[PDB]
Amino acid sequence: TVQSERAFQKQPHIFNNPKVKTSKRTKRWYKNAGLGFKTPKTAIEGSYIDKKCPFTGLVSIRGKILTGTVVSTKMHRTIVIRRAYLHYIPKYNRYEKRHKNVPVHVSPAFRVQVGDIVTVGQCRPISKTVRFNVVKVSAA
Amino acid sequence: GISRDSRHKRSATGAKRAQFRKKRKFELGRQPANTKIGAKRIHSVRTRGGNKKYRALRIETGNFSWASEGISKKTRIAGVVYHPSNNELVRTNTLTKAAIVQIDATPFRQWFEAHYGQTLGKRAASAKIESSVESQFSAGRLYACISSRPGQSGRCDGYILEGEELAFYLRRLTAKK
Amino acid sequence: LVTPQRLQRKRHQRALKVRNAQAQREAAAEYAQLLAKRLSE
Amino acid sequence: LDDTLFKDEITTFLTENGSQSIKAEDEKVVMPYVLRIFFGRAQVPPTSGQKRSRKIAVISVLPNFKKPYINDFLSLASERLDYNYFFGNSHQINSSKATLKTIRRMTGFVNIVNSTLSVLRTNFPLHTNSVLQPLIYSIAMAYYVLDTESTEEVHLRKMASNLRQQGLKCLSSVFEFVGNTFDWSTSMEDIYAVVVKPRISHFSDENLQQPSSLLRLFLYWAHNPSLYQFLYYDEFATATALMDTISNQHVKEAVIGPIIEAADSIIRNPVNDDHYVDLVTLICTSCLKILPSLYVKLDSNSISTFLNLLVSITEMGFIQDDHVRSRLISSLISILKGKLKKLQENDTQKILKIL
Amino acid sequence: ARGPKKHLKRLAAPHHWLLDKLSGCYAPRPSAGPHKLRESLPLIVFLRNRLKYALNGREVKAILMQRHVKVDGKVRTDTTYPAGFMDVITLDATNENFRLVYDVKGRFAVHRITDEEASYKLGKVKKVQLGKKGVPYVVTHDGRTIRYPDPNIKVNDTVKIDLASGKITDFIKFDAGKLVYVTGGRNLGRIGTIVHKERHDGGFDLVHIKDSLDNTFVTRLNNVFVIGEQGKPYISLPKGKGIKL
């Protein structure tokens, strides 16, 4: 699907002139996010439009980069991850099994399943609950 | 007034908060300048700092540009033909960004005649235009897409739909009618 | 009321305008000379 | 008469097929004063952004309605102006009127006419009494003051030079926009006398660093088959001026090139009339002059098109004798000395046909 | 806090001004000026509590408006003008000049100075950019902008600038192993050579420095103010030379 909604989904300011008959009639801009992180070929040469895409969307990753594991995948372009860690209990002088759930935007370029180990980064907040955009997946 | 924050909404763990402090000036919400076709009516609002935001409520003239040739001109408006916000808004003729409209073709016709000498309808390599757009010229009635935010600048600046997106929104128009 | 001091103020205003124009032009010319010489070298 | 909504009111009622578009008899009776008010609205100086905005508005206004209205507008412009001095004489003026106000009228006319050309590129006609007479009269006044006065009136001499340059460029623009709409033989004698007065005298010494409107106008003269009238009217004065430009080695390659596309066009275009043989022999002398060129003065497109000129010379054979064949072998050795990496296989094969 | 705060209580005054505690309850706030808010030093405190040429605020005011004090070749006139780090003060009836600098404990202190050194000053080249007409410019720490700068200038540099005329004299890169000044941090104020520079990609870029008593320590490029080469400091340091016993 290329017209998944009732508006002409396209990245803005890109104009391909019909006057010139270039072989590549669909111009796809992207950006090397860098930060020591690679840009997937599926992203740089996909056929999807995503403004929240960490590598093709008009939002930059910056600040904090965090790791997690995929829990639920019943949701479009966004996946929640689980962080487990140790706790600071002074009374019994111990740790404790702690868990947290962090929803994060995911780009259609990457492929995800439940149980994958993924890394995400901080971006400008987009929705009421989401705060982050993925940058890599990894098999587990 | 029209609030802006989100503490009035529930939490993400299934809970409802309480009141923290009253509405302040730095979370203002204001009226949409829902513009209809009419006499150019622009209102000035002095906003935070020394800003001057102009909101239009009736408009009959806007600036629109042809892309492939690369020209731009002031022009009238017939009126909205489509806007994915609400078809009822389209019917009521509410001007808004990312909307589809019908616009006059006589200014571009005069431009083409003056610059080219070949009258559209009925330097050929540079005078070739799309079949749909030249039929629109012959009828005198062209299409366009407006994407200027109304209640920010009171301006209506857009482009005439080129072949791919022109046919895209034309098939949308036909699926409507 | 038109005054000799108003005339003086007018001539001074024009003088300062042309003065800063000249100074800006001189700074631009010197920067251009310096850039040309460094790029050649 | 209002100012703050002028473009709005124009684009609302005054456009045809628009709201309250003016009927035929209504415009017939009211346009004259509409012409006068727009004469004022163009006489307004655009020394600010909004002022130039309304000026571009009015210049977009003019090419809408119909032509005779604009023709009468230009007639009123010329009536404010005059050419009857010159044309009660032939190239004389009894009362030399070079006043700064008069030249201001001249310049305002130049501005309006060039703006009208720019906005009405093709559909404009040439109302002779308002296009031929006033432009030549203006440039004649420019030359008159140039040769009469000293350098003392710096303002007057400066605006005279600017007026002359603008007249040349606007005449070139109108010529290239009409092409061959109609025969201008009414004043070809006068306009070509004006052309031959300063140009062929001093066409190479001054206008040699960057391309000139005169040069491109002469290129159009060679290009259009009906524009050889000057060439065949004078004893190839323009051809000799072009030859002098070619011979002058201080001219830049991007100026000399267009001379050579013009030469290619004029060689290609055949006319079975008098002096065409002398003209093509003069272009043979031009080839003799360009023999050392293309490698000491002159650029892939230019070298390719000059090679095509040489090829076409070979096929059509307007130059045949042993002298020009020795010159052709000299050109061949020069151009084979020249590079071939930045060329095309077809261009090399055309070199092979020359050989 | 409805809006801006225009006071400073005495106790929360910047602890590196070393005001006496039991004098009152209010502190002098520097105005808006060429230096920051926590790390400046106003003429009022410099005259009342460093030069001691004063006994009372109104006395400082009187001297100021009689205009014996000009800052960086420019007469100031308030009691709140915020002189900043490595700055110039000039008094004529004394033939005194003051290079305002830091000490071992990180306070400001004076440096008696004569004209041949007062005539120059050194901005930390901090932000290079270009604007309208594509004209170039550089931004030093003091909030001073310099249009049409030398293309041989990059970020994190130190440029020696004339004061009266205002044209650049020269400058100095950021190069490893050079005499430099650390502005902030726990152990700010010491001077040594930067053996190398660790880089974090858009992060804290830590730097290791040896001091002339030959000891290693760690700073950051935000706190480092480049001074000069080995054996050639370009500004007459106050005694101590970064040695802490």
Add this chain to the structure above:
Amino acid sequence: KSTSANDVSVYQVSGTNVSRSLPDWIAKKRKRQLVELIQDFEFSEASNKIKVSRDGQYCMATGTYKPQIHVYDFANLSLKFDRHTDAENVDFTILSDDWTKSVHLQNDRSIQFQNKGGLHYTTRIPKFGRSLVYNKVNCDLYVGASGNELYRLNLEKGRFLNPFKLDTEGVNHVSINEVNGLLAAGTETNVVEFWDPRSRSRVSKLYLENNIDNRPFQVTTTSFRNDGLTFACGTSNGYSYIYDLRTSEPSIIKDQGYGFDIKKIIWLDNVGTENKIVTCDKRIAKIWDRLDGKAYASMEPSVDINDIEHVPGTGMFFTANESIPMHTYYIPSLGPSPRWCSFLDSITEELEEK
């Protein structure tokens, strides 16, 4: 203070001074750089609709920019007070004889409640309402909405018993008759339906008609007359039919004006006859005697209109529109100036001797 027709005297006691083609804002700038009855009879930007309260003393108006309601009084002859709301109201009505309770259909797909104490909470509607009316024998706010729904809510119940069905895309015009408490709804698709309360059943469906130019109509008025028995419908070609209560034959037929849609058709209990009033976006308002169906008068306001009202007694016509001033009109030929503006008899004398 003017007069348009020659045989009949009318009066633009309030309105624009200059007729057409010149900006009202530019005009006021110029002239104020260089006589009103009710000061600030004005929103200065636009106006949507006026409903005079049943007390005959209030004037509620909807102003567009900074959407708000103007509350004029005739005792003070000025603004009682203004009140801002969120969006420019589409439909409003004063439930009581006084404006103490007012309810307005708001284009944000919602309904809002002005009260003397304040503004009671807004409530949404599932489908965009198009025409809201209050049934006054059974306390009902019912709106023909976007599509096939005619939503309903009671002032004792507060639920939605059933959104009634109108088998067309839109609900073009609605009226309720209380002489016979029936429901009338005309639709641009040339379909008019009549519904019966106490039985929740539509009782009529009719009005398949075409014009001379062969185009489906746009019925912007579906009202009735003072008797509450015969009804009138009005549509785009200056086309007004008037039916009786139980006939398919148009009792009155007319076409006039232009292709611009007639905006309101209103009866008038004239002293000896019944009169009829059209307001149309041909920028026109015309006066007939119904029995002759004859054009006793025609009036050109020189600026177009969005809504009109008449004073219950006689003489005054409020007109709320997109203009800078919403304006009122006096007719001497149907009655004198109302009591609070009694001196306009003298004003009429002044214009006549003028």
Add this chain to the structure above:
Amino acid sequence: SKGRKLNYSVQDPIANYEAPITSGYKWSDDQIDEFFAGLLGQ
């Protein structure tokens, strides 16, 4: 949905808003009902 669903949910202020009102009927509804019968249906 957001606010586009019709559920017959209780609204206290409007339920006790202004009711009750009068039976403002100028007829007995019997002739009215037989007049409905005698409308354009017959």
Add this chain to the structure above:
RNA sequence: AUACAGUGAAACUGCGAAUGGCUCAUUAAAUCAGUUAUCGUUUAUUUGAUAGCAUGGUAUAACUGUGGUAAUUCUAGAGCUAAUACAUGCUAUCUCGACCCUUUGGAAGAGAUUAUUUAUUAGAUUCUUCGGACUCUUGAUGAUUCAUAAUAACUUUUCGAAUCGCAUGGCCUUGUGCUGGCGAUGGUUCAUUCAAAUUUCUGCCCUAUCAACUUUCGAUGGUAGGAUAGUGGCCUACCAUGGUUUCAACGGGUAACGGGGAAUAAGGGUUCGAUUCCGGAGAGGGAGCCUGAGAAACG
């Protein structure tokens, strides 16, 4: 001093009154404490850079008189007069330089000569006179579709000194010709300065005689649109049903405003936390609203 000039009433105009000060009743990540973002934004002023007609208009306060009323920090009516008041408006440079010249260069000539809104671009990644020649393939970050630079227009719309002190010169066709001192006020943009606005990471009292929850009216996001300084279920139009969890969600209990500090048994740690510091919140009821850089002020 025959324009005024000293002094200074009133009044007009500018600036400022959002600081300071007080109060603790609220609230268990609500702020808070620490940290970060701003490649998510606005900024009076300070400070730095920054801009190619001898001078015009009206319309008034303070003033004077007449009043009225029982009447205010009452008004009417009439007659005056200024702007940093209001509203208006005017004034030669840069490219190649043939040719002359050698110095030092001119020299006709062909050329270019503030802000708004959109669109389209750029802004990419070997020989040796062993004495010497090159005879080849913007900055920025981790990055921005950045800065910038341009094209075309576009704008109910911007300024681009119609002021001002102290002195008072310079030249000379001694004209009152033409220039010119020190410095206040204004005004563009950027920078910078004080903030502000959101937001990353962690950390809350007792509690299961509270296991189930939001999911409507948004409870999760997407698309799309309006909303300011800016993204945003901020709001809304269409799709999906997400999401807390005994890893106690959820609610409930706190005459607990938060933090720091203090006392406290010798030693576990226990008590005020009221103090003099830094945050938060606030003053007949409510709402609408006005200014201004800054506000739901207490005006």
